[PDB]
Symmetry: D2
Subunit: 259 residues, 4 copies
C-alpha cells in the first residue's frame, strides 16, 4: 500500500483543456496510487472540483496548510504506517516508459526515490551533484552556484521513515539529504526524452498549454485525463465510464483499442 | 552494415528554399531525419532530392566527414512515388540492409535510441512504426486483429480501418530493391504490403509517450517549432543536433568537436565537451 | 516620385508563417505607394531574390538589384543605390522587420508625402539597447546607436523616409543609419512620428522572434480570412495590376491556399 | 453613458497575465464609461465581486446582477434608467491603433445604435451584416447557414434610450435589426489592422494568450490593464496608483515615472 499527497500551495487554472491538478493527480494514478490527500490553502474549491474521487475509483481526502516538508506533518495521520508519494501541484510530466519509471520507484519498499532532470535553470530547484561514476554525492536547495544542471523534479517516493525525518526539522531538500546521508536515496535520471514542464509562471503556463495542445491534436489522445487512467487501471468499469469534446473522448475510449 | 536514405521531395513560402532546408526553430529540418538515422547507428546515408535542391543539401552537409559520416547525393527526376528511392539508390544499397526516412518528419521521446537500435539490429524482413493520430487518412494506415497482429495496410484510405498511421521511418532487408522493381505512383505502402503478405513485416507501436510531428504545412511547421523551442529552452539541451549525436556515438573525438565549434550553436558544442549528460 | 530600398544583409528568404520574409518590407514600401524598389543583398543572396521576385512587372513594380560586397553598415545602402536614387526622394526598409496596424497606410502616406527632411518612427519597446534610441524633452533632442544606458524606451524602427540630402550626408560619414538621422536632427529636419502601442512592430531576426512573428501572423490570418503583407493583393488594391493580371498570377498557385486567396480577392468587397 | 459586461468560469480565466474580464472592462473604460453593471450566473457573480469590488480603487462604480443576450437590458433596466448604454461580451478581446477614437466616436452619438463589422473566416458563428454596392448595411442575420458576407458584428454595442423598450417587445441581432429598420443603426468597419480575438474555446484562449504575450514582451507595455487606463483618464491620481501598486506592481510603479505616447 502506497498513499499519495498533492501539495497545491494556480492548480485550478487549466493547462489547455483540463485543470492543472489533473496532471499531478494522473501521475499518482499512473503510479497505482488510489488513496490521495490534497493539501492546499482553495481546499473547498478542490473538494467542489474532485469530490471524494469514488467516481474515478479513488479515495480523495483534503487538508489545509512554511515549506514543502510541512506536508508530512499535516498528512502524518493520513500516511499512518504506509509508504508515501509526494507531488507538487504545478508540475506536468510526459514521456514513453513513464508508467514503468513510476512503477519501479513505487515498488521499492525501503528508502526514498527522486528524479534528476537536466534543466537550463538549475538554481530554481533542488540540485543533485554526481561524481565521475554517476553516483549522487550532494543536494543543495536553490544554490547560487549549482554543482550540476540536474534539478530534482517535484515527484518524491518515501518509505515509513519520512514522517519522523520531517518531525526533526522546512525544505523537502533537507528530508531528501537525510535519506542521502543514510545511503537510502535512489536518484533515477529522467532522460531528455521525457518532458518535465513548469506551469508556475504566465510564460511557462502558456508554453505548457501549447505543448499539450500540439500532442493532443496530433494523436487524438488526451494527456493526464484521470477518467482514462482509472479505466485503464480497471478501477472503474465500462458502465461507470459511460455514466461519467471531453464527454465525446470518454465515449471513444470504450470503442477503441489504444496501445 | 545498414545504409540510410533520406528522401527530401518537393508555395510561395518555399519558393526561395525547399521544405527540408527550412528551419524547425533553431536548425534545418533535414537535421531531424539525419539525426534519427545517426541515432540508429547509420553512418553511410544517401540524400535523394530534386535536381534544384540536391546542390543546396551538398552545400549545407558536404560529404559528412566533419560528423564522421559518409554522405552521398542522388536526384529524383520527378515525384513519381516514395518507393522510387530504392530504384535511385539501388547501387548505393548493394547487398546491405537499408533504412528509409522522409525529410519532413520529426521524432522525440525516451527510449528512441533503443526503439531504433532494436529495428536496425533485425537481420530479416521489414520494420515500421504505428502511431495513434487524429488524422489517419493523411498516411499509410495499419489495421490490427483482436490479438494485436497487423492484418492490412491502406495508402491514405477514405475510411481508415484504425487511427494507427505508419510513420515516415522504414527498416528493410536485402529483399526491398527487387520488391520495388516489380511495382507498377510507386507507393511505399505496396512495398510494406509485399513484406506483410510474406509474414516478414514487424509493426512496432510508437507509444503516445513519443512525439511524431508533421513539419509539412505552414501550421505544423509552426507547431513543431514551438514544440522544440519549449523542450530546448527548458532543458538547455538541443533536439536532433547532428554534431552532438556524432560525438556521443564516438564517430568524432573532442578535438574534432572543438574545431567544428570554433567558427560557430557553437557555444552549445563547446558546452558538450565540459559536461556529463545522462 | 519616391524610390524604395530594401537592405537584406539567407534570413529575408525564410518564410514568416505562409510567405517569404521579404514580402513584409516589400508590401510596406508598396502600401506607401512606392513602385520602383532596389533590393541590396550579399553577392550570394542577390541572385536568389532575382529568382523569387523577378523585375516585379507581374506586380506592377520596377524591381532592380545591387550587391553589398561586405556588411560595413546600413548607411552604405545610399552609396550603393546613389545612381538608383538620382535626384528623387527615397525610403529605406530593413529586411527583417514586420509592421501591422490600423492607419498604417495613412502613417506611411503622410511620411512619404513630405517633400523635405527625413521621417522616422519611434516605438516603445522593452529592449531599447538593441536599436537606435530617440530621447524626447515631446520634441526629439538626441539619437544613440545601441546605447548601454538608453535615454528612453523609444526605439527607431527599420523604416526611413529621406529627401535629396541623404546621399551627400552618407558620403561624408566615417557607417551607422543613426549618424545619417542625427545629421538631419542637427539641421532640425528630422520628423520623428510616434508609432503607437496599437501597432505591432516585431523582430524576425532570431529563432525565438521568427517563431513569435509566425504565430502572430497565423492568428490574425486564420481569424480574419485575410492575409498580411500579400504583395499581389496590395498591387491590385493600388490598381497597379487589373483583375485579368491577378487571375493569371492566381492560376498556377490554384493548387494551394495562396492561389485560392488571390481568386477570392476578385469576387469580394473588403473595406 | 452606462456600461454592461455580460459574462454568461471562463471570464475569470487569465489571458496570459490578467483575468479575461480585464479586457472588456478596459474597453468600456477606454470609451470613457465609469458606471458598469457586471451580469453573470448566480455562482460566478460573487467571484467577480471578490475580484473587482465596487471599483472605487480604479475610480469606477461597479454594480452586479445575476441572470439570450438581449435579456441584459431587462436585468439592467433600472441600472440604465434614462441614460445612453453600451454592452460588451465577457469573452472578447480588442487591440489596435485609434481604438480610443473608434470607441469615442460611437460613445459620442446621442441617438440610435452603433455596432462594429469585422472581416472573419468564420462568419456563421456570429451576427452577419450584409452591405450593398455603396457600402450601406442592408440586413442582419443571427448565425446564418449561408452568410451574406464575411463581416461579423463584434461583441461591442452602443445604444440610446430606445434599447430597453425595444428589448421589452431573445437575440441581440433582433435589437440591432429594430434600429436598422428605423434607419438608426450606425455600422462602423473595424479594419483588418485591429485584432478582434475569440477567447471562448481551449484553442482560441491559447492563441489570444500567445498574441498578448508577444505584444507585451515586445513593447514593455500591458494590453487592457485597468489601473493604467484609470490613471490615463485621470480617474485616479499618482497617489492612488502608488497605493494600488504596493511584475504587475512593478509595472504600475513604472507608469508614474515614464512618458508613454
Ligand atoms: C503503453 N504503456 C504506457 C501508457 C501510455 N501513457 C498514458 C499517458 N501518458 C502520455 S504519460 O504516461 O506520459 C502521463 C500519465 C499521467 C500524467 C501525465 C503523463 C496519459 O496521459 N494517459 C494515458 O491513459 N496513458 C495510457 C495508460 C495509462 C495507464 C495505464 Br494502467 C495504461 C495506459
Ligand atoms: C542514451 N541516452 C538516451 C538518449 C537521449 N537522446 C538524445 C536525443 N533525443 C531527445 S532523441 O533520442 O529523442 C532524438 C534523436 C535524434 C533525432 C530526434 C530525436 C537528441 O536529440 N540528442 C541527443 O544527443 N540524445 C542523446 C544521445 C544520442 C546518441 C547517443 Br549514442 C547517446 C545519447
Ligand atoms: C483601406 N485601408 C485599410 C488598409 C488595410 N491594410 C492592409 C494590410 N495591413 C494589415 S497593413 O496595412 O497593416 C500592412 C500592409 C503592408 C505590410 C504590412 C502591414 C495588409 O497586410 N494587406 C492589405 O491588403 N491591406 C489593405 C489595403 C492595402 C492597400 C490599399 Br491601397 C488598400 C487596402
Ligand atoms: C493614443 N492613445 C490611445 C490609447 C492607446 N492604447 C492603450 C491600450 N491599447 C493597446 S488599446 O487602446 O488597443 C485597448 C484598450 C483597452 C482594452 C483593449 C485594448 C491599452 O491596453 N492600454 C492603454 O493604457 N492604452 C493607452 C491609453 C489608454 C487610455 C487613455 Br485616456 C490614454 C492612453
Ligand atoms: Cl531535493
Ligand atoms: Cl531519454
Ligand atoms: Cl505503409
Ligand atoms: Cl508510451
Ligand atoms: Cl536612428
Ligand atoms: Cl496606439
Ligand atoms: Cl447583430
Ligand atoms: Cl485597417
Amino acid at each position: 500500500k502506497r498513499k499519495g499527497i498533492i501539495l497545491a500551495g494556480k492548480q485550478l487554472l487549466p493547462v489547455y483543456d483540463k485543470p492543472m491538478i489533473y496532471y499531478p493527480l494522473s501521475t499518482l494514478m499512473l503510479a497505482g496510487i488510489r488513496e490521495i490527500l490534497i493539501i492546499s490553502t482553495d481546499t473547498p474549491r478542490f473538494q467542489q472540483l474532485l469530490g471524494d474521487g469514488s467516481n474515478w475509483g479513488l479515495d480523495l481526502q483534503y487538508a489545509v496548510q512554511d515549506g514543502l516538508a510541512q506536508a508530512f506533518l499535516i498528512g502524518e495521520s493520513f500516511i499512518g504506517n504506509d509508504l508515501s508519494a509526494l507531488v507538487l501541484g504545478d508540475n506536468l510530466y510526459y514521456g514513453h516508459d513513464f508508467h514503468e519509471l513510476l512503477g519501479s520507484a513505487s515498488q521499492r519498499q525501503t528508502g526514498a526515490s527522486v528524479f534528476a532532470y537536466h534543466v537550463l535553470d538549475p538554481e530554481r530547484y533542488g540540485v543533485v551533484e554526481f561524481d565521475q561514476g554517476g553516483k549522487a554525492i550532494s543536494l543543495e536547495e536553490k544554490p547560487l552556484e549549482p554543482k550540476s544542471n540536474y534539478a530534482v523534479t517535484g515527484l518524491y517516493f518515501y518509505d515509513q521513515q519520512v514522517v519522523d525525518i520531517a518531525r526533526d526539522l522546512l525544505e523537502i531538500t533537507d528530508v531528501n539529504r537525510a535519506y542521502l546521508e543514510r545511503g537510502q536515496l535512489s536518484v533515477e535520471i529522467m532522460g531528455r526524452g521525457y518532458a518535465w514542464l513548469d506551469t508556475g509562471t504566465h510564460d511557462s503556463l502558456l508554453e505548457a498549454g501549447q505543448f499539450i495542445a500540439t500532442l493532443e491534436n496530433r494523436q487524438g489522445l488526451k494527456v493526464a485525463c484521470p477518467e482514462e487512467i482509472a479505466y485503464r487501471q480497471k478501477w472503474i468499469d465500462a458502465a461507470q465510464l459511460e455514466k461519467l469534446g471531453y464527454g465525446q473522448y470518454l465515449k471513444r475510449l470504450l470503442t477503441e483499442t489504444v496501445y
